[PDB]
Amino acid sequence: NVSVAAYLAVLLGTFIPVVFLITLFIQSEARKAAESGQ
Amino acid sequence: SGPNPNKQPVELNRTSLFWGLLLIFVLAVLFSSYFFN
Amino acid sequence: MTPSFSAFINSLLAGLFIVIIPIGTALLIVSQSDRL
Amino acid sequence: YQEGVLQGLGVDAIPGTDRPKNLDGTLVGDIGFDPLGFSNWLDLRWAREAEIKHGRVAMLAATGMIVQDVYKFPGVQQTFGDASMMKLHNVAVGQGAMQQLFLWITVLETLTGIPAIIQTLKGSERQPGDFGFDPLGCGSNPEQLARRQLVELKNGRLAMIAVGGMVHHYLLVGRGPIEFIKNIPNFKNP
Amino acid sequence: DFSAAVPFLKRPSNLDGAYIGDVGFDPLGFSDVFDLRVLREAELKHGRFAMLAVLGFIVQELYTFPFFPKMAPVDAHDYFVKQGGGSQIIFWISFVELFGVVALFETLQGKREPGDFAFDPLGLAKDEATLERYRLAEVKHARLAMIAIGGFIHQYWVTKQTVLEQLGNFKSL
Amino acid sequence: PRVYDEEDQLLILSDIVTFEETDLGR
Amino acid sequence: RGWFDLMDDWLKRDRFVFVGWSGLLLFPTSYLSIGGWFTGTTFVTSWYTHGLASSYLEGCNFFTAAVSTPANSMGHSLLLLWGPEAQGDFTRWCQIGGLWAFCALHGSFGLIGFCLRQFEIARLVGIRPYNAIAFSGPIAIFVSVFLMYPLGQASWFFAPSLGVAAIFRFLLFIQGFHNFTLNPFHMMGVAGILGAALLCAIHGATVQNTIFEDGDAANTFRAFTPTQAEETYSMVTANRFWSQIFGVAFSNKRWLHFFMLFVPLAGLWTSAIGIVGLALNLRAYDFVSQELRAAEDPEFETFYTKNILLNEGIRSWMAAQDQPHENFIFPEEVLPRGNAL
Amino acid sequence: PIFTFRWLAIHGLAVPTVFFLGAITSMQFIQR
Amino acid sequence: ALRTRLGELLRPLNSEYGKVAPGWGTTPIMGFVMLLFAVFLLIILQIYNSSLIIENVDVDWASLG
Amino acid sequence: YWIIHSITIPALFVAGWLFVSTGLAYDIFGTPRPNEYFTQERQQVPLVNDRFSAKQELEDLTKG
Ligand SMILES: C=Cc1c(C)c2cc3nc(c4c5[nH]c(cc6nc(cc1[nH]2)C(C)=C6CC)c(C)c5C(=O)[C@@H]4C(=O)OC)[C@@H](CCC(=O)OC/C=C(\C)CCC[C@H](C)CCC[C@H](C)CCCC(C)C)[C@@H]3C
Ligand code: KC2
Ligand code: KC2
Ligand SMILES: CC1=C(C#C/C(C)=C/C=C/C(C)=C/C=C/C=C(C)/C=C/C=C(C)/C=C/C2=C(C)CCCC2(C)C)C(C)(C)C[C@H](O)C1
Ligand SMILES: CC1=C(C#C/C(C)=C/C=C/C(C)=C/C=C/C=C(C)/C=C/C=C(C)/C=C/C2=C(C)CCCC2(C)C)C(C)(C)C[C@H](O)C1
Ligand SMILES: CC1=CCCC(C)(C)[C@H]1/C=C/C(C)=C/C=C/C(C)=C/C=C/C=C(C)/C=C/C=C(C)/C=C/C1=C(C)CCCC1(C)C
Ligand SMILES: [Fe+2]
């Protein structure tokens, strides 16, 4: 009944910004850890 | 070519990460009912 | 030529001579008089 | 020059508020009348040029309205109907007579007015309002020329007010100057 | 204020009496914004085209060739646009203007007077005084024909009559 | 036919406003 | 100096009321808009446009008086006083609702002038222009609701009329004909407005309850002076309080104030997007799955279906008097009712 | 003195204000 | 900085950075043209708005044929 | 201050009063009087139907 496109849109529009933000945060933390003493 | 002087590092805070995750999840919750119609 | 276009031209003239020209003239006169 | 009286220093229209600082007997028609502070801030060359242009145009306009009410040129009939003051402007811009007049005065202003006023503002020897137009020897003698300048200024100043009155009386009544003189009572509105 | 033609407007800065026909008439700013040599070249080209155009407007109305139909000059432009003769005339005028470009480039560089193509087969204008008189006559006729060709064309467009056909039986608007 | 503005227009002021420390803050 | 420089100097003078270059647009337009609204709510009727009395002269009070929108016979006309509808007649111009167009247009230009005033005063003072960007929220609200929505609809008639009861009617009319509460953009707008009110109250209480004891008086308003190099309240104490009470707390004052700025602005812009969507009847009116479920199952009922029935009742029982130009005549038999269901 | 921006703005916001107050006070005594 | 044929061909076009005319330049001409453009925009706006009828101009689908 | 405004303000208030009491507001703004909401011929709500004939339509509606 419910469209394939509806589930695809919801899941992708949730995950893609989420993984973008997670990647950016991990990159920033990596820079912080590399510059600081480890 | 050569070394580009305009390169700048990009930083995202943990507060910014959580703000972004909350915004994305809340927008998904809000618009899921309308996308499913 | 139509009454609508005559009204439009008269509206342009009225906006020039009742709004733009008086306010501009008063502003210029007061600005020149009060150099402070 | 034209004497030290009626246009020069020592002649004041008021009892004298120490006179405007930028007004003296050098300029023609300077009776020291300036209740506002126009004189100092405004360029006196540009102001005198504008005054002379307004006066000449007003003299021509007042004489034109008077003659048009008095006499129509041959062939102006069969056309324009009544057309005293303002219906005449509209019907003639519709026909193209005032279009021709506007075109030729545009040529005159572009080729004489703009360059002359620009050069006068830059410090040229030309006095404001002077176009060297004297086909007849009416200004050969400076002694008569100063009086002619004063007469021109006074008649232009009178004609500005006169043509403004003619226009406003026509706006109120729909009646031109000669016809306005003919019937005094207000209630008639043609 | 010594423009010598308009007494109240002063001589223009670069309008010295070097050029023929220089009476100081330049009220608007054009000689101070563009090269005077290029302006004189354009003036002479416009005037020569106008003189030829006025002569053609007279002759075509007075006599048209055994060939081509009997037409008014503007209708003649339209007909020869659609026929092919106008294309030929444009081609040859463009061919001459191709070297006119080089002549104007020289005039920009120098070594060539504006409007001077050294065209004088009959050997007229012998001695400098006759040359100066002919230059003055050429410039005056060029300006007069520049006004006159526009007069002819606009009068034909308004009254739908050709010039000599309009001279008699005027039929005022 | 016959002057340079010499202003950066891309410049942040970028001047740090230093604040002093008192005994209470210490 | 030149005339332009002298005029700029005069307009920038430190007077009681700053004028500026933007004042030349702001003061006349805003003054005319406010005066026209007062004139319409005091004298001008709505009898020939809406079939309503909206003026103090007709007997209305502050709540029921309004400057009503033009007649639906007019399209999206500018309704110029010299325009073909009025042809210079002031009385006919007021009767056809031209005063509403006057107020709306001069008020939009007044909002533009006030935004330019904020920009100009920020430039002259020497501060960042985060005002006139906050005001972009109200500007977008006005543009979407009073300009874009009627332009998308049949005419200016369906724009909000400038009155209290008129605004309430507009609210109920939009709810009935669009189900605007169900619109997600309106939901984001409501969240933004309520969160902004929450932020204002909570920030005021937090600052008032974390002040430093900088005075011996019990009333602590005297303990502050504007020429202070020290903060008047403890940010550390407030952060500790809200971190151990709510689980999270602000640690940066600049981020806190930017957030208090951002929430109402974002809410207003989202609501403006929703109203722009409503302008073309592109509304989140119904859920197709729920309608299909209710059609094939008479025993299936949710609060959404009850809202749909309420909107249908609103439309049916307000169409006749809210749109008199349509000449709607609905018999009592076709009027929806709870018993009729 | 006679003409000032404050003076002109005040009387622009006062002369209609008093006129409208008088009009509304008259509206209060209408037979309605 | 790399030198190229296209770079040296287009170099004079990107050579006079920051070069300005003296005081107020051609500002009155720009203002006059902007005023004409504003009048033109008002004319065309009032034409489709139907607040302005010129002659033989029918802002309507039926004018297509 | 008080000398000029003890004459100007009461006169302006009385003028505002007379703008309504003399019936000039109804004539200027077209607001119908309580006795002229419905005419004998037209007992319905009067509504403008055409934008380009609005002036003539209002003249016909408000003639009686
Ligand atoms: C209904 C709610 C509401 C009202 C009444 C309102 C009103 C105002 N806010 C202003 C400012 C602001 N509003 C701001 C944020 C917000 N404001 C909001 C909501 C509102 N803001 C919201 C939700 C936010 C969050 C984003 C900021 C950040 C500012 C300012 O900087 C500014 C200020 O200084 O305030 C402290 C002033 C703008 C003055 C102006 O434009 O120049 C003069 C007035 C003009 C041009 C308007 C006249 C034309 C109007 C649009 C149409 C006519 C309306 C009639 C006169 C009255 C009709 C009444 C009926 C509708 C009942 C004004 C007092
Ligand atoms: C230089 C002086 C002069 C001026 C300033 C002037 C201005 C205008 C204007 C205003 C711009 C118009 C609109 C106009 C129109 C006509 N003129 Mg003209 N005209 C002038 C001179 C003459 C002469 C000498 C005659 C004449 C004619 C006509 C006819 C007749 C045809 C008809 O029967 O329809 C028409 C329509 C004849 C006539 O009837 O005069 C008794 C004729 O002999 N005009 N004329
Ligand atoms: C500032 C604009 C203006 C100027 C510069 C100006 C100059 C002159 C001069 C030149 C020095 C004279 C000689 C003059 C003569 C008359 N003017 Mg006049 N006048 C101006 C404006 C008005 C207004 C607004 C009215 C008016 C009137 C009259 C009457 C009455 C006759 C009558 O009662 O029938 C006469 C004799 C009234 C009128 O036109 O009646 C409808 C009327 O209300 N004027 N006017
Ligand atoms: C063509 C056209 C039209 C037109 C038009 C025209 C031509 C309109 C022209 C109107 C003019 C010239 C009005 C000026 C009147 C004079 C005034 C106000 C000065 C009075 C002197 C005073 C107050 C004081 C003087 C004095 C001084 C200074 C102080 C001391 C004493 C004293 C000496 C008394 C339309 C617009 C109608 C529309 C139509 O479609 C087409
Ligand atoms: C488009 C078209 C075509 C075409 C075409 C062509 C050739 C169009 C060209 C038209 C021309 C050349 C018009 C000329 C206007 C000149 C004027 C008004 C100057 C007058 C002099 C003045 C005012 C003197 C004033 C002066 C005097 C003495 C005294 C004062 C001082 C001074 C200023 C010096 C076709 C025919 C090929 C057909 C095709 O289907 C379409
Ligand atoms: C008691 C009370 C309780 C609660 C507190 C409270 C609210 C403070 C108080 C209220 C007090 C009250 C009752 C306060 C009310 C005060 C009032 C009624 C002020 C009215 C002002 C009218 C103006 C500015 C009209 C100007 C007309 C103009 C610009 C004309 C415009 C024109 C239009 C029509 C369009 C054509 C063009 C022109 C000609 C331009
Ligand atoms: Fe704060």
TrEMBL record, chain C:
Keywords: Chloroplast, Membrane, Photosynthesis, Photosystem II, Plastid, Thylakoid, Transmembrane, Transmembrane helix. It is a single-pass membrane protein. It is found in: Plastid, Chloroplast thylakoid membrane. InterPro entries: PSII_PsbX (IPR009518), PSII_PsbX_type_1_subfam (IPR023431). Belongs to the PsbX family. Type 1 subfamily. PSII is composed of 1 copy each of membrane proteins PsbA, PsbB, PsbC, PsbD, PsbE, PsbF, PsbH, PsbI, PsbJ, PsbK, PsbL, PsbM, PsbT, PsbX, PsbY, PsbZ, Psb30/Ycf12, at least 3 peripheral proteins of the oxygen-evolving complex and a large number of cofactors. It forms dimeric complexes. This is Photosystem II reaction center protein X. The lineage of its organism: Eukaryota, Cryptophyceae, Pyrenomonadales, Pyrenomonadaceae, Rhodomonas.
Automatic annotation (TrEMBL), chain G:
The keyword DNA-binding does not apply. The keyword GTP-binding does not apply. It is found in: Membrane; Plastid, Chloroplast thylakoid membrane. Keywords: Chlorophyll, Chloroplast, Chromophore, Electron transport, Iron, Magnesium, Membrane, Metal-binding, Oxidoreductase, Photosynthesis, Photosystem II, Plastid, Thylakoid, Transmembrane, Transmembrane helix, Transport. It catalyses: 2 a plastoquinone + 4 hnu + 2 H2O = 2 a plastoquinol + O2. Its EC number is 1.10.3.9. Chlorophyll a ChlzD2 binds at residue 106. The chain crosses the membrane at residues 16-38, 99-117, 129-149, 155-173, 185-205, 255-280. Belongs to the reaction center PufL/M/PsbA/D family. PSII is composed of 1 copy each of membrane proteins PsbA, PsbB, PsbC, PsbD, PsbE, PsbF, PsbH, PsbI, PsbJ, PsbK, PsbL, PsbM, PsbT, PsbX, PsbY, PsbZ, Psb30/Ycf12, at least 3 peripheral proteins of the oxygen-evolving complex and a large number of cofactors. It forms dimeric complexes. This is Photosystem II D2 protein.
From TrEMBL, chain I:
InterPro entries: PSII_PsbH, PSII_PsbH_sf. The keyword Phosphoprotein does not apply. It is a single-pass membrane protein. Its main location: membrane. It comes from the Eukaryota. The chain crosses the membrane at residues 29-48. Keywords: Chloroplast, Membrane, Photosynthesis, Photosystem II, Plastid, Thylakoid, Transmembrane, Transmembrane helix. The keyword Nucleotide-binding does not apply. It is found in: Membrane; Plastid, Chloroplast thylakoid membrane. GO terms for molecular function: phosphate ion binding. One of its GO terms (biological process) is protein stabilization. SUPFAM superfamilies: Photosystem II 10 kDa phosphoprotein PsbH. Signal peptide: none annotated. One of its GO terms (cellular component) is photosystem II. Pfam families: PsbH. PSII is composed of 1 copy each of membrane proteins PsbA, PsbB, PsbC, PsbD, PsbE, PsbF, PsbH, PsbI, PsbJ, PsbK, PsbL, PsbM, PsbT, PsbX, PsbY, PsbZ, Psb30/Ycf12, at least 3 peripheral proteins of the oxygen-evolving complex and a large number of cofactors. It forms dimeric complexes. Belongs to the PsbH family. One of the components of the core complex of photosystem II (PSII), required for its stability and/or assembly. PSII is a light-driven water:plastoquinone oxidoreductase that uses light energy to abstract electrons from H(2)O, generating O(2) and a proton gradient subsequently used for ATP formation. It consists of a core antenna complex that captures photons, and an electron transfer chain that converts photonic excitation into a charge separation. This is Photosystem II reaction center protein H. It comes from Rhodomonas salina. The gene is psbH.
From TrEMBL, chain J:
It comes from the Eukaryota. GO terms for cellular component: chloroplast thylakoid membrane; photosystem II reaction center. With its partner (PsbF) binds heme. PSII binds additional chlorophylls, carotenoids and specific lipids. Heme b binds at residue 5. Residues 24-61 form the Photosystem II cytochrome b559 alpha subunit lumenal region domain. Heme binds at residue 5. The keyword Iron applies. This is Cytochrome b559 subunit alpha. It comes from Rhodomonas salina. The gene is psbE. The chain holds residues 20 to 83 of 84 of the full protein.
